Design a protein around this ligand. Structure first.
Ligand SMILES: Nc1nc2c(ncn2[C@@H]2O[C@H](COP(=O)(O)OP(=O)(O)OP(=O)(O)O)[C@@H](O)[C@H]2O)c(=O)[nH]1
Ligand SMILES: [Mg+2]
Lengths: 469, 166, 166
């Protein structure tokens, strides 16, 4: 049995009680607790839980301010060591050197792990949640002063390290692959002739690849700070969730572009060619595990303007109808099949972010911030663990990069796509629907004929990659 | 038994998710997990008739505006929600109704107008303005306070009645 | 899918972190930041089966025997790493094996002996000496380079296969 400092000179030694900490019914899992108890466990001396550190650092701002968090971990770090024991006093009083058995044990089993864990929190804080520091300069000065006060040849390794990470973070990612990326594919449009780039002139395989690289980069850029507290749904969403919104807006624009390409091709035969090309792009998206790409296509095919084009879908080959149907099925029954498929593939992949947003929002609106026990308001940590489980799954899929070569011009083409032009949403959306009524009138109005608009061959080069280089 | 597919639509931040949660979840359990299977279905008894409610709430995904048509086509009845302290969300209702009519290709779709009280900020849409809008559309108006659970059952049950009487 | 808890151990500076980050992000970390304790997650298909890897990257030879034991309790498999250009790190291996055997109280805990930094020409530990040690423990020996990525997947995935057949 090891003695702890007096709860009178060190606040993190109060014993655990149903009034300051609650556990979830293999390390313990915290359901709720006071901020002091949460910090104690965040830096517990008995076991490790890097998972706790990420959860806490990702979600603490709703129950503790940055400045207060720093003050508390500094207090946690400053552990008073015990007084010599009776055996030591005897030795000291005889003029001998004390064995200090308990002092040495206390340092090895309590002080060292607690202080190392506090420093670990500081390191992860600065390395992965540096925005707290970018937004508050005094907080950073306090951190630097603290790390700079840490004495001892032992802690030296970590002090120097954290100091360097901090400096690196203030003044401002190579990739190695198992294999070599496949060769870029070209169809009608040739390299350098960006003016000719379009849905049917670029190779469908390369369209899916370049959009996958683009969508992957957008997905990988979303930080947890843009999600916690449901900030993307609030009035300052543009300020707090810029990367998320940019990712969603690209997806929306691409869906609208697919719809536009379809309804503006008035000639039935050419429209059938346009729809088939888009389904081939979906097929490559599936091969690449770009789920965001797959749903962009499904969303377009199920939009009001396109969904009603019976004469067009009637001419689509069965193998393609099947492909579209199976893609559509991923979202049915609340994405049941999509969730099963995502959990089974081999990354890299580009997940559909929508699911995550809804789950985070509901977790936050359906759980209380605090649980009350005997008049005490304990932080509801299980709520935070649930949100961090979601941000954690998002981060896991953000790690693996795609082994595909970027083609600058094609990438530029898609970055600048603007189907809506200068029109407002409602007007553009009404335009697409009116175009749909024009090209395929409601029954019993007869189907009119329209002149061709494409002067180049409409035959698709297919979706199987070629291999010459 | 009959299953009713209900879709909750409206501007972001009006409390659509809280309504769904309040209707579905167990209000007598410490923790709620929306990632759990079928946390969107609830068996209920309405006017002595037992049925299964399947609720699609896309709160949080409002920015994916091009996915709206697809999400809406899955429903038989719709809850059109606005926040009583947010006039813009009230003014958006008209377009949501028109879009629902378009994707269901019918001028007579089962729906209920729902005004939700999200917090204690000042109300900007009065009961009469909303009642008049609902009357002009020929649909019921229900006011809720998802936070206190008032009117939640009423909003969904009223919608189911609209579906049964279509 | 099955979850596997892997733990990477070995003397400080051998490449535990670089190996893990290369596996996780396909990125080579050139700077040296001593580790205290970090965790990573990786979904990957191995032998046609989808796995969820939990990788615990520990701090090495930092003379914190107390904490180390803490990491080994949870792990299902261990990657015991040394650098082929550092004899002392090779000599530290048996200490880790003994500790693991002790902590988990078992003579056949799944593990892989990893000789890292095989991209460097100044080798001081011969493959034969390491292979003999691996045979004495009844485990595979795999040489790797977190820099070039050589043998990295092989090391981690072989460990997964051992945990799976155990
Ligand atoms: N040339 C080469 N250098 C490597 C290789 N692996 C790691 N290094 C270098 O070795 C140094 C220490 O690598 P780390 O991965 O931090 O070592 P570690 O085992 O995690 O150290 P602790 O966390 O202190 O226990 C770094 O400067 C890396 O860049 C490798 O395969 N080849
Ligand atoms: Mg390390």
């Amino acid at each position: 049995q090891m003695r702890l400092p007096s709860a009178d000179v060190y606040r993190f030694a109060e014993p655990d009680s149903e009034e300051n900490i609650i556990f979830e019914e293999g390390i313990p899992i915290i359901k709720a607790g006071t901020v002091i108890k949460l910090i104690e466990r965040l830096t517990y001396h008995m076991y490790a839980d890097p998972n706790f550190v990420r959860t806490f650092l990702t979600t603490y701002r709703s129950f503790c301010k940055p400045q207060e968090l720093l003050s508390l971990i500094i207090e946690r770090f400053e552990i008073p060591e015990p007084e010599p024991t009776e055996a030591d006093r005897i030795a000291i009083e005889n003029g001998d050197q004390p064995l200090s058995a308990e002092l040495k044990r206390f340092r090895k089993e309590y002080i060292q792990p607690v202080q190392l864990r506090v420093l670990n929190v500081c390191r992860h804080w600065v390395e992965h949640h540096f925005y707290d520091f970018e937004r508050d300069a005094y907080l950073l000065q306090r951190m630097e002063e603290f790390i700079g006060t840490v004495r001892g040849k032992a802690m030296k390794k970590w002090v120097e390290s954290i100091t360097k990470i901090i400096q690196r973070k203030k003044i401002a990612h190579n990739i190695t692959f198992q294999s070599s990326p496949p060769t870029v594919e070209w169809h009608i449009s040739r390299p350098g002739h960006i003016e000719t780039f379009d849905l049917l002139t670029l190779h469908p395989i390369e369209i899916a690849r370049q959009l996958t690289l683009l969508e992957s980069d957008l997905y990988r850029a979303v930080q947890p700070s843009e999600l916690v507290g449901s900030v993307w749904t609030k009035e300052d969403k543009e300020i707090n969730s810029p990367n998320l919104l940019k990712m969603i807006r690209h997806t929306t624009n691409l869906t609208l572009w697919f719809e536009k390409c379809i309804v503006e091709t008035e000639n039935l035969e050419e429209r059938v060619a346009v729809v088939s090309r888009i389904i081939e792009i979906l097929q490559v998206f599936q091969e690449l595990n770009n789920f965001n790409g797959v749903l962009e296509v499904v969303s377009a095919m199920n939009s009001s303007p396109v969904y009603r084009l019976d004469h067009t879908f009637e001419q689509i080959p069965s193998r393609q109808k099947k492909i579209l149907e199976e893609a559509h099925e991923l979202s049915e029954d609340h994405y049941k099949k999509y969730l099963a498929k995502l959990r089974s593939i081999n990354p890299p992949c580009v997940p559909f972010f929508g699911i995550y947003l809804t789950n985070i929002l509901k977790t936050e609106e359906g759980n209380p911030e605090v649980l009350k026990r005997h008049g005490k308001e304990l932080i509801n940590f299980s709520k935070r663990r649930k949100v961090a489980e979601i941000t954690g799954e998002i981060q896991q899929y953000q790690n693996q990069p795609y082994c595909l070569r970027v083609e600058s011009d094609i990438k530029r083409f898609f970055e600048n796509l603007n189907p809506m032009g200068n029109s407002m949403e409602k007007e553009f959306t009404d335009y697409l629907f009116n175009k749909s009524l024009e090209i395929e009138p409601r029954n019993p109005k007869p189907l009119p004929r329209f002149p061709k608009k494409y002067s180049y061959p409409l035959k698709s080069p297919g979706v199987r990659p070629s291999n010459p280089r | 038994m009959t299953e009713y597919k209900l879709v909750v639509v409206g501007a972001g931040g009006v409390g659509k998710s809280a309504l769904t949660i309040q209707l579905i979840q167990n209000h007598f359990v410490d923790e709620y997990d929306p990632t759990i299977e079928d946390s969107y279905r609830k068996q209920v008894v309405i006017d002595g008739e037992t049925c299964l409610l399947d609720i699609l709430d896309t709160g949080g995904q409002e920015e994916y505006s091009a996915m709206r048509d697809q999400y809406m086509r899955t429903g038989e009845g719709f809850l059109c929600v606005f926040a009583i302290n947010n006039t813009k969300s009230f003014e958006d209702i008209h377009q949501y109704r028109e879009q629902i009519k378009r994707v269901k290709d019918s001028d007579d779709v089962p729906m209920v107008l729902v005004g939700n009280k999200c917090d204690l900020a000042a109300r900007t849409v009065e009961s009469r303005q909303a009642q008049d809008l609902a009357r002009s559309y020929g649909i019921p108006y229900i006011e809720t306070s998802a936070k206190t659970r008032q009117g939640v059952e009423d909003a969904f049950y009223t919608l189911v009645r609209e579906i049964r009487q279509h």
